[PDB]
């Protein structure tokens, strides 16, 4: 119910711009506790209580996938990348081409095997690849897919020891999950200031979902719950299963230091093993230091942004257990 | 029932040496038509009729996987390759570690993402990789896996248009399938000479299953039904769905020319679109020209030996439809 | 008597094709227990008991040396390599040129020292070298050596701590030793099935001694006792002195798995510290999976195929102690 909750949300396709299938399902499991409104741009916003705008929580729906840019003469699909993938993760891998008519499966096979003796033994760049969907010609392809349909990897699900979980799309699905688990566990409790949960769009392509929020939402403290890339010197003693991490500093922003304490305190004062770190990249929260106390805490992750992303199942536990015990005790 | 037959047989793990799980299941669906004997080395042999030994048919159970060679101090698994894989297909991919106690899942994640700035932007070699299984230490790993346990990729299944099929393990599973479909369709027909169906072991590591057969089985004509790697100049006008291919020539052997005719004839004379080709590598049949008329016919395949192998579903149809209409009309 | 037994057998020159001097001496110490026959090709074969052919044991006489291919105008010897040496082990080293007239010593000195200032600071390839034997001219050389005389390194002997031993030619001499020690310890015991000890030729150049055996000797289980190259990831937890190793898998063959157990069992059931491994290269045994249960067990070795090969003296102890306790209790 934590797993299958997770299996349920990684499986949903939807990269930046195209988050529909994800937020429709968030609404399936939210409809009947709390009350939503949907941004223009796309954002699920869900206030709790009324009054001055206190905390804001953001996990983003969109993920990294491929935009279909056009079609070849023999009906293979061209694509650009949306977000940040690594090409070696593109070569010879099933995908899942999402269209209007609905899901449709193909394969970025392109794998000239052992017996061709022009050995392309370097990594083959994202633009030399195409998707196979079994189309016979340029025409037959359009029967099935049009430009600006997008696609995503057929995602395996794996539970490693008993503790960990691997699949592509933890960034930031787990987060979307958390802010649901951690919203059912609120509301009827009510004793508050006034906290705003949000499910952002287009984070992986420039945070644009949260840059849109930054209007109408001037809160006091704005959090992001995205991933925390793990296990490099520069990650200090962060290791997996030693509880949620506070992105103190990344590449998008170095974050409020007093806010850091204010949670770190609530942390130990509340029986939790929060840990602290310095990584790379950025987080929706860093769209708010514009004017706002920002910080984003997260779960440390291995093999990030690959279909092998691996979060520890306890940290997730403790992290909702904290990003709740924040919305009160702050 | 052709698909799910195929889905059923690719899903079974078992690389060279370790074919058990595969032949036990072949026997589950053969037990009660025809009669088997199992080689020393491992081979399923199934005669039909009695008398001089006429034709021999071989599809091999084993596949390409990874042998676990040892364990690291932090409980990651080391492995060698068994067979011929390409390393770019090793990087960051779920696998499935088969042990004695039974199946156990892990991930060759190893994917230093975007934020480490020593960019290993070349392909990372098979020996710098390890499997993650979520073990905490060298000790905790052995609790789960021992050397000479082996592993295989979590295999997706994909049906491309309606026609084609992708998954890792068509080589030579489809073949194992064929020689089953095409053995249920025999026997009770009986009108013969005397044909031997065999399910070989260790083909992908030197044909050693069929090199073992070469004793006790001196037939008249020996066929192999393995893959036919496709879509390179040197493949002539072989294209997918234009019916089974006759490996005229590969790298292991150039095959009987009269036997080629003798089938090519039976082909057109029997309403089939056999095609002919020159590829690379070898086939169990080429363990018999030692003394024996050899030839191996097959289904053309794209993206071979990658988890994206793609055979056309008709060819398979027509190929059983022919490797039957051979066991009589030859 | 284990050492000097070993010192005695490494010292004997004889590479593939030219094993005489070795098997004559094996016969000096075997003549008067058990009874031999010598293959055409060269193999010492020594049955024990009579009846169905049960086990076969092979250690090979030949070693890596140099074939003299011709002679220079100033009476230096040209050579090819027989087997697999590494060139850096050729540069500037005494050798021992075996002729018909008998032993004759020379030196692959060739060592342009410090004062020539064209610095050949890369490794100098096997074909730029010649042997010095002190001959004054092309003519004077032939007075001493003719083509297809061969040569071998002057071999030092070293006993490292008290435990280990270094010298060039453990592969497979130690093995030849074992199957002698372990044949004097049989015979008069007699209680058997029927075991065949063999001393093979030409293993280091394609196993051709044992490929010749494969006729007339169809046994039930065929073992090889050759070296086991040691101390690389891919060698798992094999370390020196932790008892004989079972080559589970190498590059020539992945070996019977049930036979592996059947010894591993007899092992622990018999008070021995057998260990298991995956290395590279091959073994005479792998000439039998042709039709036969093959496996080769061995002693782990460091610095293999160099005049520094280093086996642990206990393992050798325990290995005869086991390859005896096999010839009965199997
Ligand atoms: Co994210
Ligand atoms: Co991300
Ligand atoms: Co195959
Ligand atoms: Co293959
Ligand atoms: Co040897
Ligand atoms: Co050797």
DSSP structure string for C112-156: --SS-SS---SPPPTTS--BB---SSHHHHHTT--TT-EEEEPPP
Dihedral sign from CA coordinates of B274, B276, B279, B284: positive
CB distance B198 to B39 below 8 Å: no
Residue A270: other Cβ atoms inside 10 A: 15
Query: Which DSSP letter does residue B154 get?
Result: P
Distance from the alpha carbon of residue A92 to the mean position of ligand 2, in angstroms: 22
Burial of residue B29 (CB within 10 Å: 0-12, 13-18, 19+) is: middle
CA angle A13, A14, A19 (to 5 degrees): 140
Instruction: Say how far residue C209 (Cα) sits from the centre of its chain.
Output: 12
Instruction: Calculate the dihedral angle through the C-alpha atoms of A127, A133, A137, A139, rounding to the nearest 10 degrees.
Output: -100
Contacts of C227 (CB under 8 A, 6+ apart): C170, C171, C172, C174, C175, C298, C299, C301, C304, C309, C311
With an 8 Å Cβ cutoff, the interface of chain C facing chain B consists of 233-237, 248-249, 253-254, 256-257, 276-278, 289-293
Instruction: Calculate the dihedral angle through the C-alpha atoms of C80, C85, C87, C88, rounding to the nearest 10 degrees.
Output: -150
Distance CA B110, CA A122 (A): 18
- Choose among A324, A330, A196, A193: nearest CA to A262: A330
Distance CA A267, CA A275 (A): 9
Residue C192 tokens read as: 């058997």
Sketch out chain A's domains with CATH numbers: 1-63+155-330 (3.40.630.10), 64-154 (2.40.30.40)
Distance CA A202, CA A222 (A): 18
Parallel, antiparallel or unpaired: strands A294-302 and A227-229: parallel
What backbone phi and psi angles, to 5 degrees, belong to C247? -50, 85
What residue of B is the nearest CA neighbor of A159? B105
Q: How was this structure determined?
A: X-ray
Exposure string of C207-240, with b = 16+ CB inside 10 Å and e = fewer, is bbbbbbbbeebebbbbbbbbbbbbeeebbbebeb
CA angle C19, C211, C41 (to 5 degrees): 40
Contacts of B198 (CB under 8 A, 6+ apart): B43, B44, B45, B46, B56, B57, B58, B179, B210, B213
B312 marked ligand binding residue: no
- Choose among A91, A99, A326, A90: nearest CA to A223: A326
Q: Is B203 a catalytic residue?
A: yes
CB distance B36 to B27 below 8 Å: yes
> Which residue in C19, C203, C309, C324 is the catalytic one?
C203
Q: Give the distance between the most distant pair of CA atoms in chain B.
A: 70
Residue B133: other Cβ atoms inside 10 A: 24
Closest Cβ opposite residue B67 in set C256, C276, C278:
C278
- Choose among B211, B246, B254, B255: nearest CA to B225: B246
Parallel, antiparallel or unpaired: strands C275-278 and C294-302: unpaired
- Which residues of A contribute to the annotated binding site for Zn(2+)? 60, 171, 204, 226, 305
What backbone phi and psi angles, to 5 degrees, belong to A58? -130, 125
What residue of C is the nearest CA neighbor of B130? C233
Bridge partners, residue B310, by sequence: B166, B302
CB distance B116 to B152 below 8 Å: no
| Closest-CA distance of chain A to residue B37, Å | 35
CB distance B305 to B85 below 8 Å: yes
CA angle B240, B242, B245 (to 5 degrees): 85
Exposure string of B222-260, with b = 16+ CB inside 10 Å and e = fewer, is bbbbbbbbbebeebeebebbbbbbbbbbbebbebbeebb
Distance CA B280, CA C171 (A): 36
The CA distances from residue C282 to C18, C70, C227, C272, C326, in Å, are 21, 31, 10, 25, 22
Residue B199 tokens read as: 């399910």
CB distance C77 to C141 below 8 Å: yes
Place of tokens 């015990």: A325
Distance from the alpha carbon of residue B5 to the mean position of ligand 4, in angstroms: 20
Q: In what order do the strands lie in the sheet with A150-153?
A: A77-82, A65-71, A150-153, A94-98, A103-107
CB distance C94 to C107 below 8 Å: yes
- Choose among C155, C162, C201, C182: nearest CA to C244: C182
Distance from the alpha carbon of residue A192 to the mean position of ligand 1, in angstroms: 28
Dihedral sign from CA coordinates of C194, C203, C249, A114: negative
Instruction: Calculate the dihedral angle through the C-alpha atoms of C81, C87, C89, C90, rounding to the nearest 10 degrees.
Output: 60
Residue C186 tokens read as: 């049989």
Contacts of B162 (CB under 8 A, 6+ apart): A134
CA angle A165, A4, A164 (to 5 degrees): 15
Distance from the alpha carbon of residue A181 to the mean position of ligand 1, in angstroms: 18
Distance CA A161, CA B121 (A): 30
Look at C236 and B67 and tell me if their CB atoms are within 8 Å: no
Between helices B170-184 and B20-28, what is the axis angle to 10°?
20
Instruction: Say how far residue B299 (Cα) sits from the centre of its chain.
Output: 12
Distance CA C61, CA C43 (A): 9
| Closest-CA distance of chain B to residue C167, Å | 28
| Closest-CA distance of chain C to residue B40, Å | 8
Q: Let me know how long chain A is.
A: 330
Dihedral sign from CA coordinates of B237, B241, B247, B252: positive
CB distance B69 to B150 below 8 Å: no
Touch test A–C: 3 Cβ pairs or more under 8 Å: no
- Choose among B297, B163, B276: nearest CA to B226: B297
Residue A123 tokens read as: 């990594």
The CA distances from residue B184 to B27, B294, C136, C287, in Å, are 12, 24, 80, 37
Distance CA C298, CA C323 (A): 10
Instruction: Calculate the dihedral angle through the C-alpha atoms of A15, A19, A24, A27, rounding to the nearest 10 degrees.
Output: 100
Parallel, antiparallel or unpaired: strands B37-38 and B56-60: unpaired
Q: Which chains touch B (3 or more CB pairs under 8 A)?
A: A, C
SS3 A28: helix
Q: Please list the alpha-helical segments (H only) found in chain B.
A: 3-10, 20-28, 138-142, 170-184, 208-213, 257-268, 313-320
- Choose among A15, C173, C98, A88: nearest CA to B112: A88
Q: Let me know how long chain C is.
A: 330
End-to-end CA distance of chain A: 29
Query: Which DSSP letter does residue A132 get?
Result: B
Distance CA C71, CA C52 (A): 51
- The resolution of the experimental structure, rounded to one decimal in Å, is 3.1
Contacts of B221 (CB under 8 A, 6+ apart): B54, B55, B56, B256, B259, B292, B293, B294, B295, B330
Distance CA C95, CA C104 (A): 9
Beta-carbon-side half-sphere exposure of residue A135 (alpha carbons within 13 Å): 26
Parallel, antiparallel or unpaired: strands C275-278 and C245-249: parallel
The CA distances from residue C302 to B72, B322, C170, C241, C273, in Å, are 21, 55, 11, 11, 19
Distance CA A272, CA A244 (A): 9
Instruction: Say how far residue A2 (Cα) sits from the centre of its chain.
Output: 17
- Choose among C180, C150, C168, C155: nearest CA to C68: C150
Distance CA C197, CA C284 (A): 13
Distance CA A327, CA A324 (A): 5
Distance CA A66, CA A69 (A): 9
Place of tokens 């992001």: A224
Whether omega before A172 lies within 30 degrees of 0, making that bond cis, reads yes
Distance CA C46, CA C195 (A): 8
B204 marked ligand binding residue: yes
Burial of residue C10 (CB within 10 Å: 0-12, 13-18, 19+) is: buried
Give the helix/strand (H/E) hosting B203.
none
What backbone phi and psi angles, to 5 degrees, belong to C55? -100, 150
SS3 C46: strand
Residue C269 tokens read as: 């059931």
Closest Cβ opposite residue B80 in set C234, C237, C253:
C234
Dihedral sign from CA coordinates of A211, A214, A217, A220: positive
The CA distances from residue B145 to A32, A179, A278, B298, C73, in Å, are 46, 37, 35, 37, 63
């Amino acid at each position: 119910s934590m797993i299958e909750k997770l299996k349920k949300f990684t499986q949903i396709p939807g990269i930046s711009g195209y988050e529909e299938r994800i937020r429709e399902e968030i609404i399936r499991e939210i409809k009947d506790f709390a009350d939503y409104k949907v941004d223009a741009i796309g954002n699920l916003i869900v206030e709790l209580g009324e009054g001055e705008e206190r905390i804001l929580f953001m996990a983003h729906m969109d993920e990294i996938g491929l935009l279909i840019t056009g079609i070849t003469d023999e009906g293979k699909l061209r694509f650009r990348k949306v977000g940040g993938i690594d090409d070696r993760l593109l070569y010879g891998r099933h995908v899942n081409v999402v269209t209007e008519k609905g899901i449709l499966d193909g394969v970025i096979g392109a794998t000239p095997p052992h017996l061709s003796l022009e050995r392309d033994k370097s990594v083959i760049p994202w633009y030399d690849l195409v998707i196979d969907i079994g189309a016979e010609s340029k025409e037959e392809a359009l029967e099935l897919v049009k430009p600006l349909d997008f696609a995503v990897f057929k995602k395996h699900f794996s539970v490693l020891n008993g503790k960990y979980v691997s699949t592509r799309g933890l960034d930031d699905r787990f987060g979307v999950v958390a802010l649901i688990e951690a919203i059912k566990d609120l509301v009827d409790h009510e004793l508050e200031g006034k906290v705003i949960f949000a499910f952002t769009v287009q984070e992986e392509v420039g945070l644009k979902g949260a840059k849109f929020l930054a209007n109408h939402y001037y809160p006091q403290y704005a959090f992001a719950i995205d991933s925390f890339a793990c296990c490099s010197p520069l990650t200090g003693d962060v290791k997996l299963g030693k509880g949620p991490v506070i992105r103190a500093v990344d590449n998008s922003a170095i974050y409020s230091r007093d806010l850091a304490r204010k949670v770190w305190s609530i942390a130990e004062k509340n029986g939790i093993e929060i840990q602290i770190g310095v990584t790379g990249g950025g987080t929706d929260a860093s769209a708010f230091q514009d004017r706002s106390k920002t910080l984003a805490l997260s779960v440390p992750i291995k093999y990030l942004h690959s279909e092998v992303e691996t979060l520890h199942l306890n940290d997730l536990e403790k992290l909702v257990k904290l990003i709740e015990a924040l919305a009160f005790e702050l």
